[PDB]
């Protein structure tokens, strides 16, 4: 936890392949774990992002959950901080409501003096004109909850949740998200008990950058214990 004291730069790299459409997203910003604040900008290196931003907000930001503000009595329960120095691997399976599935693999680690997230995404079983492929999703992300539970057999932490995505027509799409973690380092995992992380997301565009801005301000707080 001593590493996160103060302000920490954050760098994110994602390389997704959605039904043959390959997109690379590079993101930079800062995070204050003490206040549980995360200010990032994920610019898509490619000309355009073939999927709505909110779909990949979970893949990009929630991969970095080590900046979450864990209460004092819950400080020991932060598996991400405990395993951060050597990094960790995070595999997400995301089932949309009858609109295919994302599979993503991410590696989180310190390089030099900056956090780095190397992410590879692949979406399959997608239907054209759908909620995701149709771009009907509005550009906004709602506050959500992520449930976290240990697993000694895999020596890793598992997460479950449902994400609500708004749509232009007014429909709300429920996407199931399942997360599996593997500690890269051989040091003690310090895995916690059941606990839920509440996330608040506000999205914005910068005026200066002509390219996609994807400016994101997040506040994540752990609770349940």
């Amino acid at each position, epitope marked *: 936890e001593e590493l996160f004291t103060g302000v920490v730069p954050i760098l994110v790299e994602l390389d997704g392949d959605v039904n043959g459409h390959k997109f690379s997203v590079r993101g930079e910003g800062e995070g204050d774990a003490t206040n549980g604040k995360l200010t990032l900008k994920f610019i898509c290196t490619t000309g355009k992002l073939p999927v709505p931003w909110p779909t990949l907000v979970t893949t990009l930001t929630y991969g970095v959950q080590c900046f979450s503000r864990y209460p004092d009595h819950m400080k020991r329960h932060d598996f991400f901080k405990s395993a951060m120095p050597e990094g960790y691997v995070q595999e997400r399976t995301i089932s949309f409501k009858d609109d295919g599935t994302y599979k993503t693999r991410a590696e989180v680690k310190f390089e030099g003096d900056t956090l780095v997230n190397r992410i590879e995404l692949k979406g399959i079983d997608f239907k054209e004109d759908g909620n995701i492929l149709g771009h009907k999703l*509005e550009y906004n992300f709602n506050s959500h909850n992520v449930y976290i539970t240990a697993d000694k057999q895999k020596n890793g932490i598992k997460a479950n949740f449902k994400i*609500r995505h*708004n749509v*232009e027509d*007014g429909s709300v799409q*429920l996407a199931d998200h399942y997360q599996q973690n593997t500690p890269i380092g051989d040091g003690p995992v310090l895995l916690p008990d059941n606990h839920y992380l509440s996330t*608040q997301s*506000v999205l914005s565009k910068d005026p200066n950058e002509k390219r996609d801005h994807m400016v994101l301000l997040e506040f994540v707080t752990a609770a349940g214990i």
Partner: nanobody
Amino acid sequence: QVQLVENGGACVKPGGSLRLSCAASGFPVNRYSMRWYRQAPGKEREWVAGMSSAGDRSSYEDSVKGRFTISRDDARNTVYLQMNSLKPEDTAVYYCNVNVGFEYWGQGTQVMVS
């Protein structure tokens, strides 16, 4: 800054009708879409109705399809939701959501058919 107040939640027998209302202060209703979420006691929150910012298109779910009549009023700065004939499946409470910025949850009103 931005706040929501709901009203119209009253006990109604099966086959009756009530007019749920959601007023908002801190933003113009026409510029932002509004959604209604249904939460049964102890169950996961779900979505029942949604009205876009323009207001010319509205969306419902299969369970309540053909029963609700979502409307908006800019002069009153309030959205309204009808129920047509109530059924026991509508025993859950209703919450009013509007994502003008960050994420806002209305206080909500209770609706049980009983």
